[PDB]
Amino acid sequence: ITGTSTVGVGRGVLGDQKNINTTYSTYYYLQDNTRGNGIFTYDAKYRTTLPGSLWADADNQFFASYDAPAVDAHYYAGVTYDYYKNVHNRLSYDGNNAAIRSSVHYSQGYNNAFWNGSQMVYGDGDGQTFIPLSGGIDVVAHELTHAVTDYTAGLIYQNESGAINEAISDIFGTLVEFYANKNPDWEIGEDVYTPGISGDSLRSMSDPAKYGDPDHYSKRYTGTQDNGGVHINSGIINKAAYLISQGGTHYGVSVVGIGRDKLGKIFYRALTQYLTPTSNFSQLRAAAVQSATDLYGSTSQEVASVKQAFDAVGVK
């Protein structure tokens, strides 16, 4: 909407106070004009019609329980925008400052969140498996990364290309969590998953097998559930990314770690310059090797570590 840029204040899902960029015209709307062509957050009102209503508030204060998922969806979209712009020189998900739209309160007790090809959508969770999913910065950044993928590699959401698609989202969701630097880790969704159970998460990149996901190509899932295992076989790529960054020995193969920033540069270049809609795991290895070659040189430690990490997870 047309109005003047304002700064509201509220509390997120985890009870933390934060400022949010709003727009004033009669009401204060969750419309952040400071980033690209705007970040817009909507109320789906427990229905499944999308996007719903642009979030309107009478006083620019967002401390109600009902407001909390909207505060975090709006704020963490801003953090994710900042990461892509400041770290990768990418202006929004399309590289041309496309408006970022998110809807919260999707459906009733909905235990998921997703990018739908047009916008982000967050359930509130059922209070047992999840609390409102926008409370997790890694969740927000994971799903916005699907938009980046849509505009770049376009990895088809099935089988190995779909597992790469998922892993790319887990990788950048985690790198955004480190960028924001609040309780960062190599786990996925820990801030919103199972409020009654401490220390768990949806997936682990450092040890995918902790939740039964494969950490080696020889343990890959070949069935048809989950679009051919896109959230299962992502563990093989997540483990390789973790090893590239942090190093370690895995199934007797040693990997020299090169750190998170170089991991992000290598995978961002692979995603935007080399991967295609049908890339498989072997092609991802080749794309990552070539990306590290471009950035650091064919004789670099970085290239050698990429090779070691894919060797360690059984991907040639």
Binding site: N111, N112, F114, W115, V139, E143, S169, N227, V230, H231
Partner: peptide, 5 residues
């Protein structure tokens, strides 16, 4: 469905 299946 996307953060999980």
């Amino acid at each position: 469905g996307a953060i999980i299946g």
